[PDB]
Amino acid sequence: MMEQVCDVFDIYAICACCKVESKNEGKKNEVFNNYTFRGLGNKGVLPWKCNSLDMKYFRAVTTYVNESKYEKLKYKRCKYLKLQNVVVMGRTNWESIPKKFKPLSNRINVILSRTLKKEDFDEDVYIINKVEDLIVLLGKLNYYKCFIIGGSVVYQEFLEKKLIKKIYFTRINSTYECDVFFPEINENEYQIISVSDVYTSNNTTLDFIIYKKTNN
Amino acid sequence: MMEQVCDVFDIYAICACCKVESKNEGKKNEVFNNYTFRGLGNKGVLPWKCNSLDMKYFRAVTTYVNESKYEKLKYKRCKYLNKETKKLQNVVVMGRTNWESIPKKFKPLSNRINVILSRTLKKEDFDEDVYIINKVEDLIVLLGKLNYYKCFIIGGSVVYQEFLEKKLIKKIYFTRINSTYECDVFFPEINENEYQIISVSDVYTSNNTTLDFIIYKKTNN
Amino acid sequence: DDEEEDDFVYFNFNKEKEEKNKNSIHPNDFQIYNSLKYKYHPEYQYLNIIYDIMMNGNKQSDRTGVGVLSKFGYIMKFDLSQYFPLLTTKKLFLRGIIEELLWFIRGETNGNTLLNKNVRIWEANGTREFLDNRKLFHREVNDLGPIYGFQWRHFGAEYTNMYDNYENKGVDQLKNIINLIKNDPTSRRILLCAWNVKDLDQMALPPCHILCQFYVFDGKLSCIMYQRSCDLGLGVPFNIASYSIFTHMIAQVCNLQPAQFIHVLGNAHVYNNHIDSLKIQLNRIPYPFPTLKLNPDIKNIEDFTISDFTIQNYVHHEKISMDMAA
Amino acid sequence: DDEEEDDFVYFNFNKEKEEKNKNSIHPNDFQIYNSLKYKYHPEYQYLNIIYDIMMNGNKQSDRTGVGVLSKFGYIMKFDLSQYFPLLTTKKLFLRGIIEELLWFIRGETNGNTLLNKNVRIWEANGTREFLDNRKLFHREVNDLGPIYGFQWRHFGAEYTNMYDNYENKGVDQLKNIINLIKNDPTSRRILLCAWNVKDLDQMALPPCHILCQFYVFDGKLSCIMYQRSCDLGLGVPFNIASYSIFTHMIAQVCNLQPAQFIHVLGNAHVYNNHIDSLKIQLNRIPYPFPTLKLNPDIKNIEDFTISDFTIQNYVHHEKISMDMAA
Ligand SMILES: NC(=O)C1=CN([C@@H]2O[C@H](COP(=O)(O)OP(=O)(O)OC[C@H]3O[C@@H](n4cnc5c(N)ncnc54)[C@H](OP(=O)(O)O)[C@@H]3O)[C@@H](O)[C@H]2O)C=CC1
Ligand SMILES: NC(=O)C1=CN([C@@H]2O[C@H](COP(=O)(O)OP(=O)(O)OC[C@H]3O[C@@H](n4cnc5c(N)ncnc54)[C@H](OP(=O)(O)O)[C@@H]3O)[C@@H](O)[C@H]2O)C=CC1
Ligand SMILES: O=c1ccn([C@H]2C[C@H](O)[C@@H](COP(=O)(O)O)O2)c(=O)[nH]1
Ligand SMILES: O=c1ccn([C@H]2C[C@H](O)[C@@H](COP(=O)(O)O)O2)c(=O)[nH]1
Ligand SMILES: CCc1nc(N)nc(N)c1-c1ccc(Cl)cc1
Ligand SMILES: CCc1nc(N)nc(N)c1-c1ccc(Cl)cc1
């Protein structure tokens, strides 16, 4: 019996957070926990500028599609109301993406705004006035999975309203200057179901963990 | 697709075979191959008496059933027969001599639907809860009317030979008893072009002999 | 498709239905550990062994009256090129084990040197009572005998006392394996062995770390360390760090990049007293590993000093005392 | 659950796509080996290593000119209570390794003894030329030096020549490990080590088999053997047999039942010249292992003779010349 959108319509969140620096004492925290990793961006950009391994991960996850498993989805979705995934982002977020890289290739780019002119951009490039308007654009489109790629503001509301199924969280294990952060995930609403191998990229170790919606 | 009986009804064969007593001819530079393991029985019984581990394996395989996978098999068998719309058990088919070789305390085989192939005997000759059929065709008819998980052909040689002849075996669970005993009945030589080994188990020791279990599967074309 | 799936069940026909001391370990207990679908973080190589010993270990009682769960033969591998394997499911300190390493390199066997730096790893092994019980009635307190350092720099030399000048006596294996790595890298004899059969009875105690074997490929160094006895809950965590650090050191003085530290465990055991703590540890999710930075100017194995080692970005769960006794 | 499956797809995002020597090796070559679904026969522990080395091994020139494919660190386990692991994918004879073993146990280092029994395992290492090139100019032909036999019974004694009676000189490790297994079974110091650092240069060649460690639990004896250098195509098959027999011998004279023989491989290599032959072997399906029977009246490790050993029901494939050179 299918009516809780997140699970229902297949919405996922994907992020990469680093550690935050505090002016009073910058390192070697006395107490650590999952919240340690919350740095999201700094002055319109990533706090660590670039990380090719995470870039590859982000791209591979948002563009991956398994067509044979698409009607198990077309089925209930229709039943509830060149396959590509949907990538929902914010304006400040969309404006941070470089020129040559916009829109994100092989992905149905969506945007959350109150001032952007739909009139102005492409059709394969949709915009929306509010959260709830997204569910709508989904019921019309043909996609595999919907990924909320940020930013902070966008992560927060999507979590509060409880639309997030899984959170593909990348832990950048180094400290940087930050001004925007990810919302403290509620350990009782979401739980870590997977932890990857550890890697070194751009002079920092990092790993990828998967947060799940405790169906419970 | 042209549906073959062995697939629709899941007819499998399971046996145990030891090494035969050779007329060592003056060569302990013996050649070995899969046919080296062909001894099925001796004077009505197993060449090796008993093997608790093989026994345990035979029982686990022939009594194992997965109810969640039944409905899928049901729709398939019924679809093939153009027929569409209390515990689940497997079937075991054996020759009359195999039947008679079983101790009374063990007949019919527990938790399995027992089917016996014979001409000299009829339902009236048996006290047990078993099915008596006098031809292979009767089995197929019987399987289309019963609720069962899988069908295992358990011997003897004669029974094995014709089921392989008729090309009704989907897979062969073969136990290689790594020892030599006196034998008078043997398992048919498997045509390597018709059957290929797809799995090999761990090696074990039981009743003073090592043994392992392999699985043959009907081939391409 | 499912065709070969039932075959899996048949091949497991002779398997034990339940885990051995599952009865004593109890699963609601490891409920986060069992809730994980994919545990690819390297720390699980260590955690999975703790789980394996707890669930299938053999109950044994040391001649001490103490109890343990033990298994025989395990192997862990850590990619030092991607991370420094310092356990993150509990808090670990490294000053002491680094000093112990520097002490081995100097060839010392003098227990006082470490005590004066408050590194008490070997203290209990050097007391008057412990040496007497080893029948070392004529050994001075804290004179550990021909252990590691002596074997690494003077194998074969006749041990006298911890203050003797053994300059040029015995085989300097440390110097030899380094020269082998530099001149003959494809050699399969680059071993550093501390188990000197002739000197065992003279040692405060036989070495736990039997030997190190090195492998060199495409400018990269790997190391295998064979441990004959492993205290999983307390010792192994430090064991992995020590030898991972050693690997980096040997690699840098030979201008090679570190590759894998391969840990081979012989008698792997878990003390019964650590079980509650280890259960707690098993339910913690590892954080990304930290990295190790060595002062790049050090090019001679003997020139390292405590200030040349730096652990960076160490994120960890709070400390746990394996023995919750006090 | 199917996306708990997609996560799997993601986690594997940083692979290469092909194995290293794919192009060089070609898989339509391991057709039979790859067609199998469940390869649980213990012989696959050895065949999978060969396949791993061939597919992922590093290319090196092991001894000047020869060239091999190598890997570092592997562990194989054989349940001696369930079978004797003599490889069946090719033919093997054990008279020679058993004589070598007895030779070891007697503490001999005289190559002529083996040669008189038509066992040439050590012939090449005892020639005038081989010895001279090892710088052993004052060593008689076939006097192998302080190798296995000598170390097992007299570790630490000064080696003189192969005819010398070294009575009550050095450490008789062999006897000591037998007494520890009998009187102190739980000990984690039951090691037999042949790698005598001080005597290496005096040996025809350093031991390939570094040490053996024993483990006792509930009347069962397990043994781990650490091999520093391993010739997968020619040596290993025999090494596994050699030590499994030794494990049985020690178990019997100690009144225990043999359990597991654990083989640890340090530098594991496959000689290029053996590739073609090993490709053939990998496409052969194993036969159930045979069994080993020792004369039950032998109660002292020193009392075994060649006729006290019988390998039974050995079913094997055609013998193979690893080196197809003519
Ligand atoms: N490390 C990571 O994984 C990520 C880092 N970042 C970093 O964070 C920074 C941007 O963060 P942040 O400030 O959170 O903002 P975002 O860029 O995510 O979004 C800001 C915009 O979202 C729109 N918006 C907010 N609420 C709604 C709503 N209810 N309906 C429709 N539109 C809405 C607004 O549009 P308008 O004003 O027209 O109304 C607003 O300007 C950048 O530096 C970026 O690089 C971002 C994502 C991920
Ligand atoms: N180790 C192992 O895995 C196995 C060992 N064995 C051993 O072999 C012996 C049995 O050998 P064997 O005599 O070759 O064979 P079977 O037990 O197969 O008996 C065949 C005989 O059974 C009946 N039969 C066979 N096919 C048909 C048919 N199509 N229609 C009607 N009746 C049929 C007939 O009985 P009737 O004469 O009444 O007409 C026929 O004479 C035993 O010693 C047994 O233990 C058997 C199987 C497996
Ligand atoms: O660096 C070390 C030193 C010691 N031990 C442990 C193993 C054993 O529990 C004990 C040594 O005693 P024996 O095993 O030798 O009896 O110390 C370790 O795990 N790591
Ligand atoms: O019982 C034996 C003796 C030798 N070798 C092999 C290992 C090497 O291929 C070669 C010796 O060369 P070094 O590893 O010592 O360099 O002999 C074995 O595998 N088993
Ligand atoms: C490579 C950055 C990246 N890594 C991960 N793991 N998650 C993300 N959501 C982003 C991302 C951030 C900002 C924009 Cl604008 C687009 C994508
Ligand atoms: C335990 C013997 C056994 N083991 C295996 N692997 N398969 C078999 N088919 C039998 C068997 C033989 C004769 C009778 Cl009568 C019943 C079963």
Coordinates of N, CA, C and O in Angstrom, one line a residue, chain D residues 28-147:
Chain D
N28 N 39.4 -17.5 -22.8 CA 38.7 -18.6 -23.5 C 39.6 -19.8 -23.1 O 39.3 -20.9 -23.4
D29 N 40.7 -19.5 -22.5 CA 41.7 -20.5 -22.0 C 41.3 -21.2 -20.7 O 41.7 -22.3 -20.5
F30 N 40.5 -20.5 -19.9 CA 40.0 -21.1 -18.6 C 38.5 -21.4 -18.7 O 37.8 -21.3 -17.7
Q31 N 38.1 -21.8 -19.9 CA 36.7 -22.1 -20.2 C 36.1 -23.0 -19.1 O 35.0 -22.7 -18.6
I32 N 36.7 -24.2 -18.9 CA 36.1 -25.1 -17.9 C 36.2 -24.5 -16.5 O 35.3 -24.6 -15.7
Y33 N 37.3 -23.9 -16.1 CA 37.5 -23.3 -14.8 C 36.5 -22.2 -14.6 O 36.1 -22.0 -13.4
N34 N 36.2 -21.4 -15.6 CA 35.3 -20.3 -15.4 C 33.8 -20.8 -15.4 O 32.9 -20.0 -15.0
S35 N 33.5 -21.9 -16.1 CA 32.2 -22.4 -16.2 C 31.6 -22.9 -14.9 O 30.4 -22.9 -14.7
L36 N 32.4 -23.3 -13.9 CA 32.0 -23.8 -12.6 C 31.3 -22.8 -11.8 O 31.7 -21.6 -11.8
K37 N 30.3 -23.1 -11.1 CA 29.5 -22.2 -10.3 C 30.1 -22.3 -8.8 O 30.4 -21.2 -8.3
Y38 N 30.1 -23.5 -8.3 CA 30.6 -23.6 -6.9 C 31.9 -24.5 -6.9 O 31.9 -25.7 -7.2
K39 N 33.0 -23.8 -6.6 CA 34.3 -24.5 -6.6 C 34.7 -24.6 -5.1 O 35.5 -23.8 -4.7
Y40 N 34.1 -25.6 -4.4 CA 34.4 -25.8 -3.0 C 35.5 -26.8 -2.6 O 35.8 -26.9 -1.4
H41 N 35.9 -27.6 -3.6 CA 36.9 -28.6 -3.3 C 38.2 -27.8 -2.8 O 38.6 -26.8 -3.4
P42 N 38.8 -28.3 -1.8 CA 40.0 -27.6 -1.3 C 41.1 -27.4 -2.3 O 41.9 -26.5 -2.2
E43 N 41.2 -28.2 -3.3 CA 42.3 -28.0 -4.3 C 42.1 -26.6 -4.9 O 43.1 -26.1 -5.4
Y44 N 40.9 -26.1 -4.9 CA 40.8 -24.7 -5.5 C 41.5 -23.6 -4.8 O 41.7 -22.5 -5.2
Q45 N 41.9 -23.9 -3.5 CA 42.6 -22.9 -2.7 C 43.9 -22.7 -3.4 O 44.4 -21.6 -3.4
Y46 N 44.4 -23.8 -4.0 CA 45.7 -23.7 -4.7 C 45.5 -23.2 -6.2 O 46.2 -22.4 -6.7
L47 N 44.4 -23.7 -6.8 CA 44.1 -23.3 -8.2 C 43.7 -21.8 -8.3 O 44.0 -21.1 -9.3
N48 N 43.0 -21.3 -7.3 CA 42.6 -19.9 -7.3 C 43.7 -19.0 -7.2 O 43.7 -17.9 -7.6
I49 N 44.7 -19.5 -6.4 CA 45.9 -18.6 -6.2 C 46.6 -18.5 -7.5 O 47.0 -17.4 -7.9
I50 N 46.7 -19.6 -8.2 CA 47.4 -19.6 -9.5 C 46.7 -18.7 -10.5 O 47.3 -17.9 -11.2
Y51 N 45.3 -18.8 -10.5 CA 44.5 -17.9 -11.3 C 44.7 -16.4 -10.9 O 44.7 -15.6 -11.8
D52 N 44.7 -16.2 -9.6 CA 44.9 -14.8 -9.2 C 46.3 -14.2 -9.6 O 46.3 -13.1 -10.1
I53 N 47.3 -15.0 -9.4 CA 48.6 -14.6 -9.8 C 48.7 -14.3 -11.3 O 49.3 -13.3 -11.8
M54 N 48.2 -15.2 -12.1 CA 48.2 -15.1 -13.5 C 47.4 -13.8 -14.0 O 47.8 -13.1 -14.9
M55 N 46.3 -13.6 -13.3 CA 45.5 -12.4 -13.7 C 45.9 -11.1 -13.1 O 45.9 -10.1 -13.8
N56 N 46.4 -11.1 -11.9 CA 46.8 -9.9 -11.2 C 48.3 -9.8 -10.8 O 48.7 -8.8 -10.2
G57 N 49.1 -10.8 -11.1 CA 50.5 -10.8 -10.7 C 51.3 -9.7 -11.3 O 51.1 -9.2 -12.4
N58 N 52.4 -9.3 -10.5 CA 53.3 -8.3 -11.0 C 54.4 -9.0 -11.8 O 54.9 -10.1 -11.3
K59 N 54.8 -8.4 -12.9 CA 55.9 -9.0 -13.7 C 57.3 -8.6 -13.1 O 57.6 -7.5 -12.9
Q60 N 58.1 -9.6 -12.9 CA 59.4 -9.4 -12.3 C 60.4 -10.4 -12.9 O 60.0 -11.4 -13.5
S61 N 61.7 -10.2 -12.7 CA 62.8 -11.0 -13.2 C 63.4 -11.5 -11.8 O 64.4 -10.9 -11.4
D62 N 62.8 -12.5 -11.2 CA 63.1 -13.2 -9.9 C 64.6 -13.5 -9.6 O 65.1 -13.3 -8.5
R63 N 65.3 -14.1 -10.6 CA 66.7 -14.5 -10.5 C 67.0 -14.0 -11.9 O 66.2 -14.1 -12.8
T64 N 68.1 -13.3 -12.1 CA 68.5 -12.8 -13.3 C 68.2 -13.6 -14.6 O 68.7 -14.7 -14.8
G65 N 67.3 -13.0 -15.4 CA 66.9 -13.6 -16.6 C 65.6 -14.4 -16.7 O 64.8 -14.4 -17.7
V66 N 65.3 -15.2 -15.7 CA 64.1 -16.0 -15.7 C 62.7 -15.4 -15.7 O 61.9 -15.7 -16.6
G67 N 62.4 -14.4 -14.9 CA 61.0 -13.8 -15.0 C 59.8 -14.6 -14.5 O 59.6 -15.8 -14.9
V68 N 59.1 -14.0 -13.7 CA 57.9 -14.6 -13.1 C 56.8 -13.6 -12.9 O 56.9 -12.4 -13.3
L69 N 55.6 -14.0 -12.4 CA 54.5 -13.2 -12.2 C 54.4 -13.4 -10.7 O 54.5 -14.6 -10.2
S70 N 54.3 -12.4 -9.9 CA 54.3 -12.6 -8.4 C 53.3 -11.7 -7.6 O 52.8 -10.7 -8.1
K71 N 53.0 -12.2 -6.4 CA 52.0 -11.6 -5.5 C 52.6 -11.8 -4.1 O 53.4 -12.7 -3.9
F72 N 52.1 -11.1 -3.1 CA 52.6 -11.1 -1.8 C 51.5 -11.4 -0.7 O 50.7 -10.6 -0.4
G73 N 51.6 -12.6 0.0 CA 50.7 -12.8 1.0 C 49.4 -13.6 0.7 O 48.4 -13.0 0.1
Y74 N 49.4 -14.9 1.0 CA 48.2 -15.7 0.8 C 48.2 -16.8 1.9 O 49.2 -17.0 2.5
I75 N 47.0 -17.4 2.1 CA 46.9 -18.4 3.1 C 45.9 -19.4 2.6 O 44.9 -19.1 2.2
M76 N 46.4 -20.7 2.7 CA 45.6 -21.8 2.3 C 45.4 -22.7 3.6 O 46.3 -22.7 4.5
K77 N 44.2 -23.3 3.7 CA 44.0 -24.2 4.9 C 43.5 -25.6 4.5 O 42.6 -25.7 3.6
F78 N 44.0 -26.6 5.1 CA 43.6 -27.9 4.7 C 43.2 -28.7 6.0 O 44.0 -28.7 6.9
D79 N 42.1 -29.3 5.9 CA 41.6 -30.1 7.0 C 42.1 -31.5 6.9 O 41.4 -32.3 6.3
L80 N 43.2 -31.7 7.5 CA 43.8 -33.1 7.5 C 43.0 -34.2 8.2 O 43.2 -35.3 8.0
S81 N 41.9 -33.8 9.0 CA 41.1 -34.8 9.6 C 40.2 -35.3 8.5 O 39.6 -36.4 8.6
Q82 N 39.9 -34.5 7.5 CA 39.0 -34.9 6.5 C 39.7 -35.5 5.2 O 39.0 -36.2 4.5
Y83 N 41.0 -35.2 5.0 CA 41.7 -35.7 3.8 C 43.2 -35.4 3.8 O 43.7 -34.7 4.7
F84 N 43.9 -36.0 2.8 CA 45.3 -35.7 2.7 C 45.3 -34.8 1.4 O 45.0 -35.3 0.3
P85 N 45.8 -33.6 1.5 CA 45.8 -32.7 0.3 C 46.8 -32.9 -0.7 O 47.6 -32.0 -1.0
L86 N 46.9 -34.0 -1.4 CA 47.9 -34.3 -2.4 C 47.1 -33.8 -3.7 O 46.1 -34.4 -4.0
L87 N 47.6 -32.8 -4.4 CA 46.9 -32.3 -5.6 C 46.5 -33.4 -6.6 O 47.3 -34.3 -6.9
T88 N 45.3 -33.3 -7.1 CA 44.8 -34.3 -8.0 C 44.8 -33.8 -9.5 O 44.7 -34.6 -10.4
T89 N 44.9 -32.5 -9.7 CA 44.9 -32.0 -11.0 C 46.1 -32.3 -11.9 O 46.3 -31.8 -13.0
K90 N 47.0 -33.1 -11.3 CA 48.3 -33.5 -11.9 C 48.8 -34.6 -11.1 O 48.4 -34.8 -10.0
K91 N 49.8 -35.4 -11.6 CA 50.3 -36.5 -10.8 C 51.5 -36.1 -10.0 O 52.4 -35.4 -10.4
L92 N 51.5 -36.6 -8.7 CA 52.6 -36.3 -7.8 C 53.0 -37.6 -7.1 O 52.2 -38.5 -6.9
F93 N 54.3 -37.7 -6.8 CA 54.9 -38.9 -6.1 C 55.4 -38.4 -4.8 O 56.0 -37.3 -4.8
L94 N 55.4 -39.1 -3.7 CA 55.9 -38.6 -2.4 C 57.1 -39.3 -1.8 O 57.6 -38.9 -0.7
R95 N 57.6 -40.4 -2.4 CA 58.8 -41.1 -1.8 C 59.9 -40.1 -1.5 O 60.6 -40.2 -0.4
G96 N 60.2 -39.2 -2.4 CA 61.3 -38.3 -2.2 C 61.1 -37.3 -1.1 O 62.0 -37.1 -0.3
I97 N 59.9 -36.7 -1.0 CA 59.7 -35.7 0.1 C 59.6 -36.4 1.4 O 60.0 -35.8 2.4
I98 N 59.2 -37.7 1.4 CA 59.2 -38.4 2.7 C 60.6 -38.7 3.1 O 61.0 -38.5 4.3
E99 N 61.5 -39.1 2.2 CA 62.9 -39.3 2.6 C 63.5 -38.0 3.0 O 64.3 -38.0 3.9
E100 N 63.2 -36.9 2.4 CA 63.7 -35.6 2.7 C 63.4 -35.3 4.2 O 64.2 -35.0 5.0
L101 N 62.1 -35.5 4.5 CA 61.6 -35.3 5.8 C 62.3 -36.1 6.9 O 62.7 -35.6 8.0
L102 N 62.5 -37.4 6.6 CA 63.1 -38.3 7.6 C 64.6 -37.8 7.7 O 65.2 -37.8 8.8
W103 N 65.2 -37.4 6.6 CA 66.5 -36.9 6.5 C 66.6 -35.7 7.5 O 67.5 -35.6 8.3
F104 N 65.6 -34.8 7.4 CA 65.5 -33.6 8.2 C 65.5 -34.0 9.7 O 66.4 -33.6 10.5
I105 N 64.6 -34.9 10.0 CA 64.4 -35.4 11.4 C 65.7 -36.0 12.0 O 65.9 -35.9 13.2
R106 N 66.5 -36.6 11.1 CA 67.7 -37.3 11.6 C 68.8 -36.2 11.9 O 69.8 -36.5 12.5
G107 N 68.5 -35.0 11.4 CA 69.5 -33.9 11.6 C 70.6 -33.9 10.5 O 71.6 -33.1 10.7
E108 N 70.4 -34.6 9.5 CA 71.4 -34.7 8.4 C 71.4 -33.5 7.5 O 70.4 -32.8 7.3
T109 N 72.6 -33.3 6.9 CA 72.9 -32.2 6.0 C 73.7 -32.8 4.9 O 74.2 -32.1 4.1
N110 N 73.9 -34.1 4.9 CA 74.7 -34.8 3.9 C 73.8 -35.2 2.7 O 73.0 -36.1 2.7
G111 N 74.1 -34.5 1.6 CA 73.3 -34.7 0.3 C 73.5 -36.1 -0.2 O 72.6 -36.6 -0.9
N112 N 74.7 -36.7 0.0 CA 74.9 -38.1 -0.5 C 73.9 -39.1 0.0 O 73.5 -40.0 -0.7
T113 N 73.4 -38.9 1.2 CA 72.4 -39.8 1.7 C 71.1 -39.8 0.9 O 70.6 -40.9 0.6
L114 N 70.6 -38.7 0.4 CA 69.5 -38.6 -0.4 C 69.8 -39.2 -1.8 O 69.2 -40.1 -2.3
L115 N 71.0 -38.8 -2.3 CA 71.4 -39.3 -3.6 C 71.5 -40.8 -3.7 O 71.1 -41.4 -4.7
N116 N 71.9 -41.4 -2.6 CA 72.0 -42.9 -2.5 C 70.6 -43.5 -2.5 O 70.5 -44.7 -2.8
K117 N 69.6 -42.7 -2.2 CA 68.2 -43.2 -2.2 C 67.6 -42.8 -3.5 O 66.3 -42.8 -3.6
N118 N 68.4 -42.3 -4.4 CA 67.9 -41.8 -5.7 C 66.9 -40.7 -5.6 O 65.9 -40.6 -6.4
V119 N 67.1 -39.8 -4.7 CA 66.3 -38.6 -4.4 C 67.2 -37.5 -4.8 O 68.2 -37.3 -4.2
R120 N 66.8 -36.7 -5.8 CA 67.7 -35.6 -6.3 C 67.2 -34.2 -5.9 O 67.6 -33.2 -6.5
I121 N 66.3 -34.1 -4.9 CA 65.8 -32.8 -4.6 C 66.9 -31.8 -4.3 O 66.8 -30.6 -4.6
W122 N 68.0 -32.2 -3.6 CA 69.1 -31.3 -3.3 C 70.3 -31.4 -4.1 O 71.3 -30.7 -3.8
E123 N 70.3 -32.2 -5.2 CA 71.5 -32.4 -6.0 C 72.1 -31.1 -6.6 O 73.3 -30.9 -6.4
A124 N 71.3 -30.3 -7.2 CA 71.8 -29.1 -7.8 C 72.4 -28.1 -6.9 O 73.3 -27.3 -7.2
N125 N 71.9 -28.1 -5.6 CA 72.4 -27.2 -4.6 C 73.7 -27.7 -3.9 O 74.2 -27.0 -3.1
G126 N 74.1 -28.9 -4.3 CA 75.3 -29.4 -3.6 C 76.5 -29.6 -4.5 O 77.6 -30.1 -4.1
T127 N 76.4 -29.1 -5.8 CA 77.6 -29.2 -6.7 C 78.7 -28.3 -6.4 O 78.5 -27.2 -5.8
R128 N 79.9 -28.6 -6.9 CA 81.1 -27.8 -6.7 C 80.8 -26.4 -7.2 O 81.0 -25.4 -6.5
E129 N 80.2 -26.3 -8.4 CA 79.9 -25.0 -9.0 C 78.8 -24.2 -8.1 O 79.0 -23.0 -7.9
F130 N 77.8 -24.9 -7.7 CA 76.8 -24.1 -7.0 C 77.4 -23.6 -5.7 O 77.3 -22.5 -5.3
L131 N 78.1 -24.5 -4.9 CA 78.8 -24.1 -3.7 C 79.8 -23.0 -3.8 O 79.8 -22.1 -3.0
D132 N 80.6 -23.0 -4.9 CA 81.6 -22.0 -5.1 C 80.9 -20.7 -5.4 O 81.3 -19.6 -4.8
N133 N 79.8 -20.7 -6.2 CA 79.1 -19.5 -6.5 C 78.4 -18.9 -5.2 O 77.9 -17.8 -5.3
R134 N 78.3 -19.7 -4.2 CA 77.7 -19.3 -2.9 C 78.8 -18.8 -2.0 O 78.7 -18.5 -0.8
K135 N 80.0 -18.9 -2.6 CA 81.2 -18.5 -1.9 C 81.7 -19.6 -0.9 O 82.5 -19.4 -0.1
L136 N 81.1 -20.8 -1.0 CA 81.4 -21.8 -0.1 C 82.6 -22.7 -0.7 O 82.4 -23.9 -1.0
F137 N 83.7 -22.1 -0.9 CA 84.9 -22.8 -1.5 C 85.5 -23.9 -0.6 O 86.2 -24.7 -1.2
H138 N 85.2 -23.8 0.7 CA 85.8 -24.8 1.6 C 84.7 -25.9 2.0 O 84.9 -26.6 3.0
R139 N 83.7 -26.0 1.2 CA 82.6 -26.9 1.5 C 82.7 -28.1 0.5 O 82.8 -27.9 -0.7
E140 N 82.7 -29.3 1.1 CA 82.7 -30.5 0.3 C 81.5 -30.6 -0.6 O 80.4 -30.1 -0.2
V141 N 81.6 -31.3 -1.7 CA 80.4 -31.4 -2.6 C 79.3 -32.1 -1.9 O 79.6 -33.1 -1.1
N142 N 78.1 -31.6 -2.0 CA 76.9 -32.2 -1.4 C 76.9 -32.0 0.1 O 76.0 -32.5 0.8
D143 N 77.8 -31.1 0.7 CA 77.7 -30.9 2.1 C 76.9 -29.6 2.1 O 77.4 -28.6 1.8
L144 N 75.6 -29.8 2.3 CA 74.7 -28.6 2.3 C 74.8 -27.6 3.3 O 74.3 -26.5 3.2
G145 N 75.6 -27.9 4.4 CA 75.7 -26.9 5.4 C 74.7 -27.0 6.5 O 74.0 -28.0 6.6
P146 N 74.6 -26.0 7.4 CA 73.6 -26.0 8.5 C 72.1 -25.6 8.0 O 71.5 -24.6 8.5
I147 N 71.6 -26.5 7.2 CA 70.2 -26.4 6.8 C 69.2 -27.0 7.7 O 69.6 -27.3 8.8

